Amino acid sequence: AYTRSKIVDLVDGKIDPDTLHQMLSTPKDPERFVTYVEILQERMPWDDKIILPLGPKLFIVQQKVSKKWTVRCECGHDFCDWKDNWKLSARVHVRDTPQKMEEIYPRLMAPTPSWQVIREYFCPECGTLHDVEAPTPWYPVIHDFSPDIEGFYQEWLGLPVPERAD
């Protein structure tokens, strides 16, 4: 239903309130995903197809030649195969002292790092912060999302699955 430029504004954080309320209060537009993902595609500097957005600067992607599925930054860096935790192949900054917590919180409003830690996760090439965790000491890294990509495209969207190698 929605105008294409209006779903762009929504991505750019610039959409008007009337259409923002319209989008929220009425049944969703079945066409959203295919318009959305195409909007993201034309904003990448690499022509490999996008399969699913993982964050603002993070995607599951289909290699134009090998047809493998991978996690990719917007800049270009492939982290891992899509069934793996990308964070395992990323770089991490751990805020575990009052000095580091007091860089992003005023004292007293910072968590205490013997109870809670800030783990920031960056792309190796561009330094982009794709995710920040707030667990305890010892706590494993978290595999956020394992999507059923086949069922989504095939059963919920009525679309062929993109070609896939291993």
Partner 1 sequence: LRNVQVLGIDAGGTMTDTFFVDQDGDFVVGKAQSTPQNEALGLIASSEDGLANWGMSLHEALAQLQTGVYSGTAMLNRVVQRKGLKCGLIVNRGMEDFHRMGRAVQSHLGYAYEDRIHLNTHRYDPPLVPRHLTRGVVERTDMIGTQVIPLREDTARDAARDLIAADAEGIVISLLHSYKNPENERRVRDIVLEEVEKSGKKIPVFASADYYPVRKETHRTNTTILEGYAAEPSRQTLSKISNAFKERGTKFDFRVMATHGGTISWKAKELARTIVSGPIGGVIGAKYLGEVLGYKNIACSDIGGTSFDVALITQGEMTIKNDPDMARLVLSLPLVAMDSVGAGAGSFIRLDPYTRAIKLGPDSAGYRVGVCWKESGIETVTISDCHMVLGYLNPDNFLGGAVKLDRQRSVDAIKAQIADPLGLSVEDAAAGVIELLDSDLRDYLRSMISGKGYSPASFVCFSYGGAGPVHTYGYTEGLGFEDVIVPAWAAGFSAFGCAAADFEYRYDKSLDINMPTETPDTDKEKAAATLQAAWEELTKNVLEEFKLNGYSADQVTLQPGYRMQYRGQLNDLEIESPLAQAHTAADWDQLTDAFNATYGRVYAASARSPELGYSVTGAIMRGMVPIPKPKIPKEPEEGETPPESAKIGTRKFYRKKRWVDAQLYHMESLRPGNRVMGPAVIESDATTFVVPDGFETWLDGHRLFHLREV
Residues that bind Zn ion in the complex, under the rule CB under 5 A: 73, 75, 77, 123, 125-126
102 token code pair: 């007091």
- Answer yes or no whether residue 3 interacts with partner 1 by CB under 8 A: yes
- State which of residues 13, 14, 17, 127 lies at the interface with partner 1 (CB under 8 A): 17
CA distance 154 to 160: 6
CA distance 150 to 159: 9
Inter-axis angle of helices 4-11 and 17-25, to 10 degrees? 100
Q: Which stretch binds partner 1 (CB under 8 A): 16-24, 58-66, 71-79, 145-153?
A: 16-24
Comparing CB distances to partner 1, the nearer of 4 and 64 is: 4
**Which bin fits 148, alpha (ψ -120 to 50), beta or left (φ > 0)?**
beta
Contact of residue 6 among Zn ion, partner 1, none (CB under 5-8 Å per partner type): partner 1
Binding site for partner 1 (CB under 8 A): 3, 5-6, 17, 21, 24-25
